[PDB]
Amino acid sequence: IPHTHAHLVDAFQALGIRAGQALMLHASVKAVGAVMGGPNVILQALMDALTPDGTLMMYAGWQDIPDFIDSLPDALKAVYLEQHPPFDPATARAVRENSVLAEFLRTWPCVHRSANPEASMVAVGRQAALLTANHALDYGYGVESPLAKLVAIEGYVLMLGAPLDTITLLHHAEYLAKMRHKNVVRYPCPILRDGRKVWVTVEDYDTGDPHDDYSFEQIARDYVAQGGGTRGKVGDADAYLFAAQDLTRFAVQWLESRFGDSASY
Amino acid sequence: MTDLNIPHTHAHLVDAFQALGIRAGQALMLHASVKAVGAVMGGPNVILQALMDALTPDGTLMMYAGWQDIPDFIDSLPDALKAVYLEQHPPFDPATARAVRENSVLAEFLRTWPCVHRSANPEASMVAVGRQAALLTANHALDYGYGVESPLAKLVAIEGYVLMLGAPLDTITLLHHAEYLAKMRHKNVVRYPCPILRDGRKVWVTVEDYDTGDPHDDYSFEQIARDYVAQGGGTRGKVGDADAYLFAAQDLTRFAVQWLESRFGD
Numbered sequence: 030i031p032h033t034h035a036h037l038v039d040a041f042q043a044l045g046i047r048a049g050q051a052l053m054l055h056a057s058v059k060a061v062g063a064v065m066g067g068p069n070v071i072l073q074a075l076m077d078a079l080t081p082d083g084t085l086m087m088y089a090g091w092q093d094i095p096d097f098i099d100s101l102p103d104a105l106k107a108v109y110l111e112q113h114p115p116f117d118p119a120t121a122r123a124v125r126e127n128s129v130l131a132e133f134l135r136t137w138p139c140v141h142r143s144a145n146p147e148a149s150m151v152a153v154g155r156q157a158a159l160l161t162a163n164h165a166l167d168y169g170y171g172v173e174s175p176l177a178k179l180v181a182i183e184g185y186v187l188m189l190g191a192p193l194d195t196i197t198l199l200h201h202a203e204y205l206a207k208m209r210h211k212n213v214v215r216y217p218c219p220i221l222r223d224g225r226k227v228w229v230t231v232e233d234y235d236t237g238d239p240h241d242d243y244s245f246e247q248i249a250r251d252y253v254a255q256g257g258g259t260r261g262k263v264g265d266a267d268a269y270l271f272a273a274q275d276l277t278r279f280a281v282q283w284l285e286s287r288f289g290d291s292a293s294y
Numbered sequence: 295m296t297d298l299n300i301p302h303t304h305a306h307l308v309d310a311f312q313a314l315g316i317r318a319g320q321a322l323m324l325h326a327s328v329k330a331v332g333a334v335m336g337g338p339n340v341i342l343q344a345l346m347d348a349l350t351p352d353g354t355l356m357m358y359a360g361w362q363d364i365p366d367f368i369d370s371l372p373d374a375l376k377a378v379y380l381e382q383h384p385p386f387d388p389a390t391a392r393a394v395r396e397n398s399v400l401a402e403f404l405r406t407w408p409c410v411h412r413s414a415n416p417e418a419s420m421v422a423v424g425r426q427a428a429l430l431t432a433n434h435a436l437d438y439g440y441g442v443e444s445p446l447a448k449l450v451a452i453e454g455y456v457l458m459l460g461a462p463l464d465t466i467t468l469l470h471h472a473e474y475l476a477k478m479r480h481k482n483v484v485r486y487p488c489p490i491l492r493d494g495r496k497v498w499v500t501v502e503d504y505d506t507g508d509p510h511d512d513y514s515f516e517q518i519a520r521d522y523v524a525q526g527g528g529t530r531g532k533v534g535d536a537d538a539y540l541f542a543a544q545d546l547t548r549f550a551v552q553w554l555e556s557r558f559g560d
């Protein structure tokens with residue numbers, strides 16, 4: 030018997046989901062198990078628990094981002110510069126890993142999607158426009174990002190069978206932390222500007238590898254170990270619910286205590 | 295033991311569609327296997343963008359969506375479990391109802407396109423973009439979803455086309471319209487439950503249709519389509535790595551009706 034809408038609603042409420050919350054979701058649909066009506070019922074149940082006054086956001090990114098063209102043979106790069114489509118928020122695919130639900134969320138009526146291709150977020154609900162508005166192209170996990178706004182509105186992160194290493198918010202903690210050294214990347218990307226394709230250079234902190242000798246799984250495990258968040262089952266999945274403000278504060282201090290620069294310049 | 299090629303470009307797919315016979319302003323129903331096409335520069339949406347470029351905004355593109363999660367099987371469930379479905383299963387919502395499982399990557403992509411229209415019959419739902427998308431998807435009756443009041447009937451009436459892009463010929467939905475039209479010695483008629491939205495609220499209705507899960511007699515759609523191709527029906531050509539077929543909807547329907555009636559007809 031597949032998990033029903035009502036069963037999931039009750040499980041979300043038992044974990045601590047409440048009306049009016051703003052929530053970023055990371056999920057593994059396989060971990061939840063069979064749901065009556067399919068994966069979209071997971072989103073419908075969560076939005077039921079949040080009510081229309083709540084907000085639900087997910088990381089989408091862009092599956093087809095051609096940020097690697099400089100590594101291709103020159104003649105192939107030339108083809109990409111002419112023929113690869115730009116990031117179009119209406120149709121750009123979300124990244125493939127752990128994003129079945131993010132792709133579902135893009136067909137919801139009244140969805141909003143932020144403008145930074147690599148860091149794009151999708152959101153539905155009362156504060157969806159606020160969270161996704163004015164997402165800067167450079168430093169997409171920084172001060173002008175949906176993650177900064179999620180912290181400012183005292184939102185939450187919900188892990189629904191998703192590995193703790195995939196918490197996007199921790200890239201915002203990396204941005205904030207005063208660390209000895211952070212790796213900067215600069216990469217090409219085609220976007221739409223006044224309805225025309227334009228290739229631009231995006232600058233950001235590397236989000237593919239850590240800036241020092243840590244992992245997000247290590248940080249999150251330490252947070253849980255000192256009492257951070259709530260834990261419970263939703264369907265077949267192990268779930269965690271974290272306050273965005275407290276987790277960000279914890280992670281910044283965690284990074285600064287281990288990888289800060291005590292030298293003055 | 296065969297390697298994947300350099301990704302096909304938008305421009306090279308447009309050229310291949312035009313070489314196959316796609317013309318501006320046509321109305322086309324597409325059956326595709328994205329895997330068969332091979333790597334595309336920009337991903338599967340580029341297949342749709344190239345096809346719409348060949349058709350222009352004056353053309354129309356339609357695909358079969360259905361509803362992957364339709365609970366049309368609940369009458370065969372024990373009573374306690376059936377009651378759970380009746381209370382908890384979501385209704386068909388055309389905005390979010392996912393398309394059927396197989397060969398539907400492009401149908402799911404079409405649903406994120408602006409100005410998409412989806413027809414109202416859950417099990418037989420079609421999605422369309424372009425000039426005649428509203429016309430094709432309008433007023434799709436709940437009963438006999440492949441019949442006189444269907445997008446397939448309208449596709450035939452406006453003299454549209456069927457494009458096969460690496461999909462097996464047996465999956466041509468239009469052949470269920472031929473079954474509807476053909477006078478045959480035996481037909482299975484089914485009634486099944488379905489939850490829909492009626493004034494924003496979930497209501498369970500009973501749908502009546504010809505069975506489309508099994509043939510009505512000793513035939514298969516692969517048989518019909520293979521006989522059609524063998525007698526010169528359609529045009530053929532490569533699109534990316536896929537072998538493609540382009541059929542006139544009216545000619546294929548007429549052929550399939552005559553095929554069924556010659557073997558099982560009056």
Ligand SMILES: NC[C@@H]1O[C@H](O[C@H]2[C@@H](O)[C@H](O[C@@H]3[C@@H](O)[C@H](N)C[C@H](N)[C@H]3O[C@H]3O[C@H](CN)[C@@H](O)[C@H](O)[C@H]3N)O[C@@H]2CO)[C@H](N)[C@@H](O)[C@@H]1O
Nearest residue numbers: 360417418463464465466467470505506507508509514515
């Ligand atoms: N074979 C047993 C039967 O399978 C049914 O399920 C079937 C049904 O959901 C679904 O059938 C769907 C219909 O829906 C839909 N309205 C049109 C579509 N062309 C048709 O598709 C089917 O018929 C085509 C041609 N022929 C095949 O190419 C295709 O593989 C097959 N899925 O696929 C399943 C297999 O056809 C039912 N479980 C029950 O009627 C019975 O148990």
Ligand SMILES: [Cl-]
Nearest residue numbers: 057058127129
């Ligand atoms: Cl997933």
Ligand SMILES: [Cl-]
Nearest residue numbers: 328397398399
């Ligand atoms: Cl496919």
